[PDB]
Amino acid sequence: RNAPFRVGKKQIFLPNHVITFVRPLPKQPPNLATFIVPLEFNKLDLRDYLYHVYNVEVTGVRSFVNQRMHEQRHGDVGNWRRPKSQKMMIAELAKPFVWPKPPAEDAREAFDYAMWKKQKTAQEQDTKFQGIRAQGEVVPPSQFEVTKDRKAIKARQSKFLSGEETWAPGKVNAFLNSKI
Amino acid sequence: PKKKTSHMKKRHRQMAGKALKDVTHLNRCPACGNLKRMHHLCSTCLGKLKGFMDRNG
Amino acid sequence: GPRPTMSGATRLVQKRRHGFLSRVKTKNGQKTLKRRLAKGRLRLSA
Amino acid sequence: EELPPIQVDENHGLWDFFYDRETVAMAPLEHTKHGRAWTVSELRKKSWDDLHRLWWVCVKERNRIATANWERTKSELGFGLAEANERD
Amino acid sequence: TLRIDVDEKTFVPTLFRPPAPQQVLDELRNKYSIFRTRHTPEYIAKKEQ
Amino acid sequence: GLKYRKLRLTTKDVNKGFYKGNRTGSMGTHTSYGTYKIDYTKVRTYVCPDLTGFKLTPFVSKTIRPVHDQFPGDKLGPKNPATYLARWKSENGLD
Amino acid sequence: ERKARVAWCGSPKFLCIAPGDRVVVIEGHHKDLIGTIEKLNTRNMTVEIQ
Amino acid sequence: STHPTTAIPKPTTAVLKTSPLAEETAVELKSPSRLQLKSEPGNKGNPKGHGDRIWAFHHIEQGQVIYSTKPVISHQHLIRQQPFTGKNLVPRKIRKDYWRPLAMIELAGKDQGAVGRSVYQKLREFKKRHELDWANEAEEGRKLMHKSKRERGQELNDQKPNSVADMAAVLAGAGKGNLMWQVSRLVKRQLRRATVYWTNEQDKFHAREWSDNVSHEVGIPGEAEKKRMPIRMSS
Amino acid sequence: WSLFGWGKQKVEERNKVKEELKQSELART
Amino acid sequence: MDKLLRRVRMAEGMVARRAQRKNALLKRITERKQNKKNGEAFTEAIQQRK
RNA sequence: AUGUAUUAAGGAGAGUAUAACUUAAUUUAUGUUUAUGAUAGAGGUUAUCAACA
RNA sequence: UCUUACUAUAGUCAGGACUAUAAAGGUCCGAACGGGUUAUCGUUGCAAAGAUAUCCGAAGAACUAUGGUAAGCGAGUGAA
RNA sequence: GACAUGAGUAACAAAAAAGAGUUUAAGGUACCUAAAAGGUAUCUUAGAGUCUCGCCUAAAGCUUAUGGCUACGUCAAGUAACGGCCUCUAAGUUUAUAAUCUGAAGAUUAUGACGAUGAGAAAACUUUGGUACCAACAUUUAAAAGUGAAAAUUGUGCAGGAAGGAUAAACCGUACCUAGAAUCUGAAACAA
Ligand SMILES: [K+]
Ligand SMILES: [K+]
Ligand SMILES: [K+]
Ligand SMILES: [K+]
Ligand SMILES: [K+]
Ligand SMILES: [K+]
Ligand SMILES: [Mg+2]
Ligand SMILES: [Mg+2]
Ligand SMILES: [Mg+2]
Ligand SMILES: [Mg+2]
Ligand SMILES: [Mg+2]
Ligand SMILES: [Mg+2]
Ligand SMILES: [Mg+2]
Ligand SMILES: [Mg+2]
Ligand SMILES: [Mg+2]
Ligand SMILES: [Mg+2]
Ligand SMILES: [Mg+2]
Ligand SMILES: [Mg+2]
Ligand SMILES: [Mg+2]
Ligand SMILES: [Mg+2]
Ligand SMILES: [Mg+2]
Ligand SMILES: [Mg+2]
Ligand SMILES: [Mg+2]
Ligand SMILES: [Mg+2]
Ligand SMILES: [Mg+2]
Ligand SMILES: [Mg+2]
Ligand SMILES: [Mg+2]
Ligand SMILES: [Zn+2]
């Protein structure tokens, strides 16, 4: 039992912090490990937290704070405030570590990627249409995407005009007792 | 302006002789028979022929 | 007419003049805080 | 992106943040296959050594969950955030 | 956890040593909280003076 | 300034000697020439026990239904100091 | 509103109707219809008859 | 006035094929120079030890490379070796927490300092011809011409992969007037022995193939003292 | 089924709404 | 100490008075957002009747 | 708005199961009455299907 | 945080010329910079004081920067 | 408060300036084809780039401040190649202490504390008062030569030119914008 560094004297038996291990950047070497730590965390803590809990030796630590956009308390209403910032730490591991590559879009069926992508597009088009209204504009009728209801009325039009089907008065417009 | 322009006089200025004139100088295209403008090239054949001479030659 | 009197203004002179410590540590500044605190203000200073 | 990969030690300390070594996150259908939280009545029969070792099993379990949440969003893996909240 | 492990009783009360290290108590409750109701005899003695 | 001036000033907004900490704690003292000496009596360490062979997990099977202790006839059931001292005698008399 | 819907069968927290018993519809177009309760949403106090 | 070359097949003087465009190998495009046909070129007019070792530093995040004869870099290197690749892409200074040694080249000749000053010359001219006249990456490979001026400048900053392929070329006799040849002219020629020290074992695989006169060693002298451990593929 | 109450649920409930629509199509044939 | 108990009782009351002011405000925001989301279903029924 | 009763230091910041409020942010127990109440099942997150003290 | 005066710590004034000085001048020509002489434009203006040309000072009673002090019964500051 | 009139009018004119190709994503049309699809061409929205031409250029360029309703993966023991924090103090401040004056509030002097726009060891490894002083101006000086600083040397003029202390690596800043082309102040995307 001999740590590579000098250990402190204040013992923490029940730490409540949550450490997140984030994927590195594309061009970063394989000896850098980035983590999300509490704002009160310091370099000395991560070095001691990564060795006593995970048995990971680090030769150096880097830390930087990421701010958060100022916001209103309730969406677009309320006073103007600023959330608590985020602290990220990069450890220079003594042993390299390489992450796995994300699965292919077609191999994400365990996460229900098919349904998730459909929902994402819907929300992607909702925030894009709301941005067109925030500029003081609207989508002209000619650019609206034709829905399934408009694709069905164009096939009926070709069937009536051609002569395949014969038009007849509606029978479900209203349920009258007269039936005339 | 001294007085507000009435509905009668403002309608006189807006529509009396300022109606949109209907274009009547149209004729069909000889290569496809689409409605093109007189003395002008067919836009559907221009782009297609312009793209057809770029592939083969 | 109005003038551009905030051109070149720094945020260190905003804390020294209308900051919070400039009011709790002065007899006349406790009134402002108490006045603004009675009205219900959130931004008591700066 | 076409370099020979390095050999990462099998027993690396940083492998404890991952649920699956191929996909950092766990499938939502297998992420909910868990029990319930310990009741205070059941913990009164555990010594300090058992409650001190169990606390750190929960800490490392939350660090493992926070790691799968951050990856799922960035990698656009899919759903699973609603199941990690109940497990956490 | 298996049923055999959750049912095992391992806690043995003590009287001359605390149940856990005395330092753990500071993590369980805030020593300087204004909501602290369990004080030491020395503190109350100083408060009465 | 119009509105940003009315927000709370942060360290990412000014640089003229405005230092505000994040409550990390004092890990030492400041020197007279601009350096820092780390006092390792204030540095904190995390005590993580050996988890090899530990069988307890953070979940309990739902087949076992949740039940609460009764302590019938005692107001301070779980916090009764009499049932903790009397229980201590039979189980652990020495310590 | 949740109390009004349950008024005839107790209170929202003391419910005297359970999924599995046959009920009769007394409102709407499909009046006097008889089916078996499949689901029982206790949040909006709505019942599903398949 | 400048003249950019075209990505057309050409012959190489090196013993290996540096790129797929290379048609021939080990071709004499000019008679041996004065020092080429010399068994022991020496540090005639340079300080003692100069040219025996050549260091290469790189930005661990953006990939910018710098060559230096001394064990440390200064501000002169950043100005005289980094061309403008866009706004907010040329650092105003050297940050100690971003720049690390990429590799270190050591020649067998303990006093042939003139052989190193030549390798350092071809490496700096190849790096200049990689940021300029990058006709082989415009429509193939990275496809820099299919990228925006912002993204194109970020890919030009990443000279770390190119620099490693420049070492295998220069150390294999690439360039005209390379002093890492040795012509006997009794006329048989060979390559001089060299050693490459790598901070990362995986960084030497950017070159498709290395010559037979280079030996690869892990770790650079002076790195361990800084508590920086080298990266080993085998582990 | 709203557009924002569709991703806040588990896959167990999201798949229970697909069985509803699946068995709803077998009755239309 | 009898004087140390008044300190705790007052602190408990202050924090309990602050949670009621915040809770009351939150209940109205949700109730307003729920009634506006339900109003989308009422408008549909009124449109189909006309 | 007035009257009656009780009471006698007030706010903010950030965070959190977005009815639940303070990093334990839905703690743990007692007693009584439970449809003749109060005013012989299902359900531990598909939760909080119980109120008063 | 404008502006006036004072105050502390700092910074700036291409080049050339004359003069007793290598450096001693509220000296000279003229950029930066600082002024705002005349004219036209503009007048719901680009601007609730701007544009163009022209003109004045430009080693001094000069100009600029970050702080500080003195103001509202009595009047602070004021080459007025 | 809503809605008219002027009026579909003025305006979108810093005397830099544009022209012709190419291309990506999504969507809208027409045809091909009716097995859905896909293909060809075109338009719309949001982009990107190539060749030619011109404008700014002691800028309308680059690097950075003040500042910021632009945006949050911005990474340092120190020097080369960094600031703050920290130590020292100026002009001043003080609901700190003592003494004193004073209708109360307060004021005064001393001390303390605080207070940069200044001063702070070493490193391409490192941890007395002209025996003077570092205001202005001039002169000289890192030896191949020239030039620009730094620091120092010597001298000149009167307007006579600070204070104090010394002497194994925490915490905070680090993104973008610099005003002729999308970010600062001018109510704003303002010819300032
Ligand atoms: K005024
Ligand atoms: K706590
Ligand atoms: K900033
Ligand atoms: K006019
Ligand atoms: K530092
Ligand atoms: K007095
Ligand atoms: Mg930092
Ligand atoms: Mg100003
Ligand atoms: Mg308590
Ligand atoms: Mg300071
Ligand atoms: Mg930058
Ligand atoms: Mg001022
Ligand atoms: Mg003069
Ligand atoms: Mg002049
Ligand atoms: Mg004037
Ligand atoms: Mg005038
Ligand atoms: Mg004159
Ligand atoms: Mg008119
Ligand atoms: Mg007109
Ligand atoms: Mg006009
Ligand atoms: Mg299309
Ligand atoms: Mg700034
Ligand atoms: Mg001090
Ligand atoms: Mg300073
Ligand atoms: Mg402008
Ligand atoms: Mg300008
Ligand atoms: Mg503006
Ligand atoms: Zn045609």
Side-chain angles (χ1 to χ4, degrees), chain A:
Chain A
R1 317 282 69 70
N2 224 317
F5 53 88
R6 199 173 176 182
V7 298
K9 307 296 174 51
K10 275 185 182 178
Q11 303 177 4
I12 307 300
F13 289 94
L14 308 168
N16 195 22
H17 317 287
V18 185
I19 314 303
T20 315
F21 188 24
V22 302
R23 190 180 288 275
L25 301 181
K27 294 195 190 311
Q28 275 182 348
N31 62 4
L32 298 175
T34 310
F35 304 84
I36 306 175
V37 301
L39 209 59
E40 44 268 7
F41 229 61
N42 60 56
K43 292 182 185 180
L44 309 174
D45 291 18
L46 187 67
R47 183 177 63 174
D48 181 289
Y49 188 97
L50 273 171
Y51 179 79
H52 288 112
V53 188
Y54 293 92
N55 193 30
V56 173
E57 303 185 14
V58 302
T59 77
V61 197
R62 316 203 182 105
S63 88
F64 57 101
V65 174
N66 299 324
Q67 220 192 24
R68 295 279 152 266
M69 274 307 298
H70 55 276
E71 55 160 37
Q72 263 175 308
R73 165 76 46 73
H74 332 260
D76 33 352
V77 184
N79 58 307
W80 283 89
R81 56 189 302 283
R82 192 189 289 280
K84 189 166 66 178
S85 38
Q86 182 198 58
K87 181 172 281 181
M88 288 198 167
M89 288 195 177
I90 307 167
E92 312 186 29
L93 310 175
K95 284 178 173 180
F97 185 86
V98 178
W99 284 59
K101 302 216 170 188
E105 286 198 17
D106 46 358
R108 301 172 184 177
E109 202 74 80
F111 300 84
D112 201 28
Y113 181 75
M115 209 53 49
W116 179 82
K117 189 58 172 172
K118 290 190 192 300
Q119 161 165 340
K120 185 199 172 181
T121 298
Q123 300 173 344
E124 213 173 29
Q125 298 171 342
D126 186 317
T127 190
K128 172 170 170 297
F129 163 86
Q130 288 174 10
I132 292 165
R133 298 286 301 104
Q135 299 172 31
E137 294 196 351
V138 293
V139 182
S142 56
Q143 303 307 328
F144 266 107
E145 181 183 22
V146 305
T147 53
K148 289 182 179 180
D149 81 320
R150 276 187 63 191
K151 285 174 155 164
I153 194 168
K154 287 183 188 181
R156 281 277 199 168
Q157 188 195 5
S158 314
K159 287 165 177 289
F160 288 137
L161 283 170
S162 67
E164 299 169 31
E165 303 190 14
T166 308
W167 188 89
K171 298 169 187 176
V172 296
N173 298 344
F175 298 129
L176 308 171
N177 294 40
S178 309
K179 297 167 184 171
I180 65 184

Side-chain angles (χ1 to χ4, degrees), chain B residues 2-55:
Chain B
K2 254 288 199 194
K3 287 290 183 179
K4 165 173 173 180
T5 304
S6 56
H7 186 260
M8 184 193 80
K9 292 187 177 180
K10 80 186 192 187
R11 285 280 297 192
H12 272 310
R13 180 188 57 244
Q14 288 167 359
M15 274 148 267
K18 287 134 187 208
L20 268 39
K21 300 188 175 196
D22 307 88
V23 299
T24 183
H25 51 274
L26 307 182
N27 55 13
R28 297 274 171 178
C29 168
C32 73
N34 274 10
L35 259 174
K36 66 172 198 63
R37 218 195 300 175
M38 214 172 282
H39 291 91
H40 287 42
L41 282 167
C42 173
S43 88
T44 52
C45 289
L46 167 56
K48 283 189 174 177
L49 286 163
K50 181 199 302 213
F52 160 82
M53 295 186 291
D54 205 89
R55 313 203 206 90

Side-chain angles (χ1 to χ4, degrees), chain A residues 16, chain E residues 26-30:
Chain A
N16 195 22
Chain E
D26 282 357
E27 318 201 25
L28 300 173
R29 47 79 165 160
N30 179 19

Side-chain angles (χ1 to χ4, degrees), chain H:
Chain H
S1 186
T2 68
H3 322 271
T5 46
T6 324
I8 46 151
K10 285 186 166 181
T12 37
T13 60
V15 73
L16 263 181
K17 283 201 171 184
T18 50
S19 64
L21 296 172
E23 288 278 38
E24 289 157 294
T25 176
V27 189
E28 292 97 320
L29 295 166
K30 207 186 179 183
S31 45
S33 68
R34 187 197 135 211
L35 287 194
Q36 228 157 8
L37 37 61
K38 211 163 191 174
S39 87
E40 209 283 329
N43 220 43
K44 182 168 163 198
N46 297 83
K48 175 79 177 180
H50 193 276
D52 277 317
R53 301 167 151 195
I54 301 166
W55 288 264
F57 301 77
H58 80 305
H59 202 292
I60 66 182
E61 294 251 328
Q62 295 179 25
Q64 329 197 16
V65 172
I66 283 172
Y67 297 102
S68 83
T69 58
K70 296 182 191 175
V72 300
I73 48 171
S74 58
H75 192 60
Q76 278 197 19
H77 299 70
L78 182 59
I79 284 169
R80 292 150 64 165
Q81 304 203 22
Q82 187 58 225
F84 186 91
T85 47
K87 193 179 184 178
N88 307 124
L89 291 172
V90 183
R92 91 199 169 197
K93 70 168 201 171
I94 311 186
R95 282 193 57 161
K96 50 154 158 269
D97 54 323
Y98 279 125
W99 286 88
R100 296 287 188 277
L102 169 55
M104 176 190 142
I105 305 175
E106 190 197 31
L107 305 166
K110 56 174 297 283
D111 274 348
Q112 301 177 21
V115 178
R117 280 181 297 274
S118 186
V119 170
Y120 177 90
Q121 193 211 355
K122 311 305 180 186
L123 283 173
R124 272 206 64 182
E125 290 179 322
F126 267 120
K127 191 212 178 202
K128 186 201 281 185
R129 222 167 73 77
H130 271 297
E131 305 153 331
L132 287 53
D133 195 357
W134 37 269
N136 70 327
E137 302 171 27
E139 275 87 43
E140 307 292 340
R142 296 202 287 193
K143 294 185 171 188
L144 300 189
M145 200 62 70
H146 297 241
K147 291 157 154 281
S148 65
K149 302 283 283 200
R150 171 70 186 182
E151 280 211 9
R152 183 185 305 164
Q154 291 174 320
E155 293 287 88
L156 285 166
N157 277 125
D158 184 12
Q159 294 300 323
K160 190 259 227 169
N162 287 333
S163 158
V164 175
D166 293 16
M167 291 178 200
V170 172
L171 296 176
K176 275 178 308 189
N178 195 324
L179 286 197
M180 281 222 37
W181 286 101
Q182 188 196 346
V183 191
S184 288
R185 197 154 193 166
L186 180 46
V187 44
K188 138 174 160 189
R189 48 181 208 164
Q190 72 207 42
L191 282 156
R192 325 217 186 209
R193 290 285 176 174
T195 309
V196 200
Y197 290 98
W198 296 98
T199 288
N200 188 344
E201 260 202 27
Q202 201 203 35
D203 268 7
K204 94 194 187 188
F205 285 92
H206 282 286
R208 301 193 175 284
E209 194 177 7
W210 284 92
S211 186
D212 302 12
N213 58 307
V214 303
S215 315
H216 304 274
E217 280 283 333
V218 194
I220 299 173
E223 202 60 4
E225 285 68 33
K226 272 139 165 290
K227 294 293 188 183
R228 303 174 185 172
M229 301 176 193
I231 299 175
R232 303 171 182 280
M233 286 222 312
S234 45
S235 81

Side-chain angles (χ1 to χ4, degrees), chain G residues 8-36:
Chain G
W8 80 266
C9 71
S11 37
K13 284 191 177 173
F14 296 94
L15 194 62
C16 278
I17 201 172
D21 55 57
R22 293 182 307 114
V23 287
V24 68
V25 184
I26 62 171
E27 286 172 12
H29 303 76
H30 303 100
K31 208 187 177 189
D32 73 35
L33 194 74
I34 286 172
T36 308

